Amino acid sequence: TENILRKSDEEIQKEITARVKALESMLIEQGILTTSMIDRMAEIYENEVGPHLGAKVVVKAWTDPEFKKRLLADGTEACKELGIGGLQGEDMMWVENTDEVHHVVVCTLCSCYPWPVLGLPPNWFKEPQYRSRVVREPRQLLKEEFGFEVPPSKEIKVWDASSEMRFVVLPQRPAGTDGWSEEELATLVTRESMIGVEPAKAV
């Protein structure tokens, strides 16, 4: 944490703010950036695109075995059945948690993440601490950081998104949910559950 060389958060924010406003001013004068373009991008990823979309896909797979087969066969084509897809999810591969296998996804080299089903990644996903450790000690990381104990006999598969292929975890359907509606099941599906750092919420 502590770096004796580091400025205050306030001084860093002040400097970045001036640098970004300067660069913004130049791109505006070039005719390539506008206030309406900025607002549209922000609105899409604040209000429109987020992990509620991934949850619709999971609950459809949980309640429709044929859809779940199509999802595991070709994730992009399956999500398009629900009008879900686009930027940074052109190529989606969904991986199924089971009693025998647990999947967790990372991008060690940068911040690659399936925007159309999860929205923009949380800061911890993009940061070096998670990225460095999850390929090396995933069992210990899940227990220590997320309170998620994966018994040692169970295989952990870590998916490092080094390409434009995007990996998304289909979590196991929690016990106690027989005959639940898609709306009720969606309350159990979290961003964390589709990254693989947590199971879906217990009832």
């Binding site: 944490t1 770096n3 860093i12 970045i16 703010t17 001036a18 970004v20 406003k21 300067a22 660069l23 913004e24 001013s25 130049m26 791109l27 505006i28 070039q30 390539i32 950036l33 506008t34 206030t35 373009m37 900025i38 899409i44 990823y45 695109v49 897809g85 686009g86 930027l87 940074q88 052109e90 190529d91 591969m93 990372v106 060690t108 080299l109 940068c110 800061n123 911890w124 940061e127 070096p128 601490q129 990225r131 460095s132 450790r133 390929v135 995933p138 069992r139 950081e145 040692p152 006999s153 169970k154 295989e155 598969k157 870590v158 998916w159 490092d160 080094s162 390409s163 434009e164 292929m165």
Partner: protein, 228 residues
């Protein structure tokens, strides 16, 4: 390149910082940094692979501790200077102006409907990197392959932790833009793409988790056959 951004397997970076909640954008500057990507991409500053190669060239201490969207600003300036679309001396002068006058207006400008259409089409349509090539795939599911020990100075997706390691081909995805050309300004030159499974003992040595594996995406030139 062998930069510090290649963190897979690095020890000592510290505990994960995970607040119980957080906004999508922590400050107005982050929204600007984010929207600048479609703007500079449409204006030909960089493609996606070049965008990543700009961030890989940051000061490593700055990279490790700076706000994520600051990495985006650094790559815009990098490619702005590289293409002659950004004059550094003017940018420095404007920086000092907005330090001194933070509430000074942005330049007068016209709104452009074509930029909104660009945003909506990119977001809902995507920017697919899949390509058709003339050559069939060299490899197939179940082939045992070794990952290259090459250490290019330019852009590539060759994490140090997988270099020279043996794995099994899990899936052939088809051909895609090749980062080793695209990220260095040498074009898409698409190559077949495979997911390869590496055991944790292969990666981390005889003490590794015997019940863990890492799945890593490999373009065809990255891998050569051990056993078909």
């Amino acid at each position: 390149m062998n930069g510090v951004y290649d963190v897979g397997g690095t020890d000592g970076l510290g505990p994960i910082n995970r607040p119980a909640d957080e906004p999508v954008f922590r400050a107005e500057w982050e929204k600007v940094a984010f929207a600048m990507f479609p703007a500079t991409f449409r204006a030909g500053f960089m493609g996606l692979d070049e965008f990543r190669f700009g961030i890989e060239q940051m000061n490593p201490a700055e990279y490790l501790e700076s706000p994520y969207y600051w990495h985006w600003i650094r790559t815009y300036i990098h490619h702005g200077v590289r293409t002659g679309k950004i004059d550094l001396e003017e940018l420095e002068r404007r920086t000092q102006y907005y330090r001194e006058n933070p509430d000074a207006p942005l330049p007068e400008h016209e709104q452009k409907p074509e930029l909104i259409e660009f945003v909506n089409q990119a977001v809902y349509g995507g920017l697919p990197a899949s390509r058709e090539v003339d050559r069939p795939p060299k490899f197939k599911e179940g082939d045992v392959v070794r990952f290259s020990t090459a250490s290019p100075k330019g852009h590539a997706r060759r994490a140090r932790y997988v270099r020279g390691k043996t794995g099994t081909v899990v899936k052939h995805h088809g051909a895609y833009i090749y980062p080793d050309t695209a990220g260095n300004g040498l074009g898409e030159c698409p190559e077949h793409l495979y997911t390869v499974r590496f055991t944790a003992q292969e990666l981390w040595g005889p003490e590794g988790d015997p019940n863990s594996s890492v799945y890593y995406d490999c373009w065809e030139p990255y891998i050569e056959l051990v056993d078909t």
